[PDB]
């Protein structure tokens, strides 16, 4: 469990993924050419996890860039860290997916799938010990949604013993007026339930609300939304990238975070909530930092944690702070609001601390929660799906690709069963 | 590279074609000989070893007059001789003549030239068919062509630009017959179709461009602008530009329900005092003003099942979102219970260009609203009434029967129109 192979699929997948690479390279002290320039050797000690060592002083991301559209490849390559990626790793098609899951999963997607798998094979065989895989994609479009889930199942066949971790963006009518999004997301969720080990639920509804209500940005942009995502992706991966408390990988996380197989959808969260140009003064202490990361307003998923119960929680703190002050503040929360942490999972809230803070921020805290409240996100998609499906609206685009109504009713059923499951453990009490 | 083939049939088709290609040439800097000084335009124009840009179009007419004007015109040399096809005698406003009698004699030749244009395509997106509902060629030849394109190109996308008959702009008594006959025949072969009510264009030309007696050139130059707005997304690579196919997915919820209402703004006369400027809120408000519609109908007393905005020029997201709001508070824009609200917006970098010797004023920003409304069924209803008046007495029927048609074909076409009207009724009723 050392090396992770990253895959970014679709417009959203490549957009969000590009920013993740910009962020981590900066923290690991890597310039856009691929050379090291950093101060401390701690940035190098675990570089092998996301970066390959090329001939000389060149560190190349173990990333595979995938799309059925050329548009996205052209922009990412011109982008800030575009010259860092391996040119052979750009697996891009000509005719897109038309924000249709069926095209990405069955038609156009199935024609490009093997080309991608050939690049995943090459990268996998150059690993001393393959830890697992990480995919960035949206569930709203066609390539990220359709081809992304097709990639997951095909990888699952070849690497059954490897961990599959995804950063999955959930659609919202508040940000994107593409009507078929609830169909694409419902068809994708079904796949993720079956084939992923861990999924970070990045909700665009929550991202929009943070930018609008909290950050006070009247017209939020994808850049504003993606700034929140990169912060979360940097924070969730700290433990895999830095020597800040060793011997913890993708599998140790899954084993301790997922008590039941299907219930592997995490509610991410970050503190403090920042803006790309907001010049913030050197302040913030651990009691307020802990208080923020447990509040609904700090969640990357539009769910009220107070509406459910926590199965498991992982909290990661960054910067030069007092570890003593951290643990004391953690149980303070637990004991004060005990009705929101399952009694049948002793010591279910784990904390990690890392001396290296992110860019600009002197101290921050990322939150990873496995809460039954995530059923609110699934119910929202389910309601949007049924409204359309009840009147068989826009169905011809899917049946036209060879799909049947049976597949839709099934996707809906699994989505409803997942909701029942969350409710089942929300009501579960260890009195008998 | 995502190419699109334009087909222009009959007088109206050919004449609008001339206005469209003149305007495209201007927007991409292509000269009447096919040369350009020193991209996405390649979807509509192919290149030679001479650096000549040849439109991916075929002009067809069963009569030579209209195309002979093109063959001798300013844009002679722009089109190769082989792509301008003519017959000797027209269909004489008879659908049966254009479809069977005269039509049968030229169809294989037209298809042979389409096949030639298609071999030059590494990813043909589809066809754009331009024709009138009224003409014998516009109706019967187009129907025959659509049936054949479906055989040769299977599911391959076909969009129409159809001219809707109006008494005040040179109709003929039998035009209601040809309109219904062509509508029925083409219905299953057309994926999407934009109707252009000649009365609506006539009214804008008078009430906005201040032309008491508008010519076809005046009418066609106005249609050209609206067609250019619809096709801009395909001919230009824009950042905040949404592709016409994405609007299409939102615009057509059921295969038969494929007739979007088009609205354009601002339509300002070249002679009026230019100083006034134009705001995003002003054009969005004009996008819901019935006087700016391409088809004479009432959406205000009707339901929406998609509402899209196509911007071009100097347009910023901050302005558009403010414009999408305020107007939905004041005006009553009712959507169907199975459709979300939220307008699908696309903004192109390239501002709206005007023909130098034209009657249209140059603007910094312009908008085209494509919306799917139940209100469009009112245009079918007007046509159906005129058909019923004549058909009751079997007036003019003998001209069709004399050419090989059956009286049963008339009833079948009308039955399909009644089904379409009932289809538009059912689509507007709320669910349970």
């Amino acid at each position: 469990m050392r090396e992770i192979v990253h895959i970014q699929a679709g417009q959203c997948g490549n957009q969000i993924g590009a920013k993740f690479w910009e962020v981590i390279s900066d923290e690991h002290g890597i310039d856009p050419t691929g050379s090291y320039h950093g101060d401390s050797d701690l940035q190098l000690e675990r570089i092998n996890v996301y970066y390959n060592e090329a001939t000389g002083n060149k560190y190349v991301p173990r990333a595979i860039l995938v799309d059925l559209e050329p548009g996205t490849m052209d922009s990412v390559r011109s982008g800030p860290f575009g010259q860092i990626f391996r040119p052979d790793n750009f697996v891009f098609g000509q005719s897109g997916a038309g924000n249709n899951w069926a095209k990405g999963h069955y038609t156009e997607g199935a024609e490009l799938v093997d080309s991608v798998l050939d690049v995943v094979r090459k990268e996998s065989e150059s690993c001393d010990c393959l830890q697992g895989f990480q995919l960035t994609h949206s569930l709203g479009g066609g390539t990220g949604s359709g081809m992304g889930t097709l990639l997951i199942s095909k990888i699952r066949e070849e690497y059954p013993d490897r961990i599959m971790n995804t950063f999955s963006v959930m659609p919202s009518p508040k940000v994107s007026d593409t009507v078929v999004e609830p169909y694409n997301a419902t068809l994708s969720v079904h796949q993720l339930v079956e084939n992923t080990d861990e999924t970070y639920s990045i909700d665009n509804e929550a991202l929009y609300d943070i930018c609008f209500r909290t950050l006070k940005l009247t017209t939020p942009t994808y850049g504003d939304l993606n700034h929140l995502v990169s912060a979360t992706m940097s924070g969730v991966t700290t433990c895999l990238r830095f020597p800040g408390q060793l011997n913890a990988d993708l599998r140790k996380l899954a084993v301790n975070m997922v008590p039941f197989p299907r219930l592997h959808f995490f509610m991410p969260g970050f503190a403090p909530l920042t803006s790309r140009g907001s010049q913030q003064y050197r302040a913030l202490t651990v009691p307020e930092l802990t208080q923020q990361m447990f509040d609904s307003k700090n969640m990357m998923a539009a769910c009220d944690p107070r509406h459910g119960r926590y199965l498991t929680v992982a909290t990661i703190f960054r910067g030069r702070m007092s570890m003593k002050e951290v643990d004391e503040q953690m149980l303070n929360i637990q004991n004060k609001n005990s009705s929101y942490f399952v009694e049948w999972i002793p010591n279910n809230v784990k904390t990690a601390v890392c001396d290296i803070p992110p860019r600009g921020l002197k101290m921050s805290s990322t939150f990873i929660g496995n809460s039954t409240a995530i059923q609110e996100l699934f119910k929202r998609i389910s309601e949007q799906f049924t409204a359309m499906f009840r009147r068989k609206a826009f169905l011809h685009w899917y049946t036209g690709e060879g799909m049947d109504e049976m597949e839709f009713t099934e996707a809906e059923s699994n989505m409803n069963d997942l909701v029942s499951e969350y409710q089942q453990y929300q009501d579960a009490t260890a009195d008998e | 590279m995502r190419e699109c083939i334009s087909i222009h049939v009959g007088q109206a088709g050919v004449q609008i074609g001339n206005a469209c290609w003149e305007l495209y040439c201007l927007e991409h800097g292509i000269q009447p000989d096919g040369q350009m000084p020193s991209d996405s335009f390649n979807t509509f124009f192919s290149e030679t070893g001479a650096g000549k840009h040849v439109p991916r179009a075929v002009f067809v007419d069963l009569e030579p007059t209209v195309i002979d004007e093109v063959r001798t015109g300013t844009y002679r040399q722009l089109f190769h001789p082989e792509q301008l096809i003519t017959g000797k005698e027209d269909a004489a406003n008879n659908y049966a003549r254009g479809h069977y009698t005269i039509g049968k004699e030229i169809i294989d030749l037209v298809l042979d030239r389409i096949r030639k244009l298609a071999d030059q395509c590494t990813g043909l997106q589809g066809f754009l068919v331009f024709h009138s509902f009224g003409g014998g060629t516009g109706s019967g030849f187009t129907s025959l062509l659509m049936e054949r394109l479906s055989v040769d190109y299977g599911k391959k996308s076909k969009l129409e630009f159809s001219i809707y008959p109006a008494p005040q702009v040179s109709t003929a008594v039998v035009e209601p017959y040809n309109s219904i006959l062509t509508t029925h025949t083409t219905l299953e072969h057309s994926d999407c179709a934009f109707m252009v009510d000649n009365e609506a264009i006539y009214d804008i030309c008078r009430r906005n461009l201040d032309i008491e007696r508008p010519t076809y050139t005046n009418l066609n130059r106005l249609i050209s602008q609206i067609v250019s707005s619809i096709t801009a997304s395909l001919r230009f690579d824009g950042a905040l530009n949404v592709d016409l196919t994405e609007f299409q997915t939102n615009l057509v919820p059921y295969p038969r329900i494929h007739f979007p209402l088009a609205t354009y703004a601002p339509v300002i006369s070249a002679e009026k005092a230019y100083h006034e400027q134009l705001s995003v809120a002003e054009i969005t408000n004009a996008c819901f003003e019935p006087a700016n519609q391409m088809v004479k109908c009432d959406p205000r007393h009707g339901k929406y099942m998609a509402c899209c905005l196509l911007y071009r020029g100097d347009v910023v997201p901050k302005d558009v979102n403010a414009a999408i709001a305020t107007i939905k508070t004041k005006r009553s824009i009712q959507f169907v219970d199975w459709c979300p609200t939220g307008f699908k917006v696309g903004i192109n970098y390239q501002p709206p260009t005007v023909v130098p010797g034209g009657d249209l004023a140059k603007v910094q920003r312009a908008v085209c609203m494509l919306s799917n409304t139940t209100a469009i069924a009112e245009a079918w209803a007007r046509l159906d009434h005129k058909f019923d008046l004549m058909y009751a007495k079997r007036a003019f029927v003998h001209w069709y029967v004399g050419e090989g048609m059956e009286e049963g074909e008339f009833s079948e076409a009308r039955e399909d129109m009644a089904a379409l009207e009932k289809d538009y009724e059912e689509v507007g009723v709320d669910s349970v």
Partner: peptide, 4 residues
């Protein structure tokens, strides 16, 4: 909605 016009995000950007």
């Amino acid at each position: 909605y016009v995000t950007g």
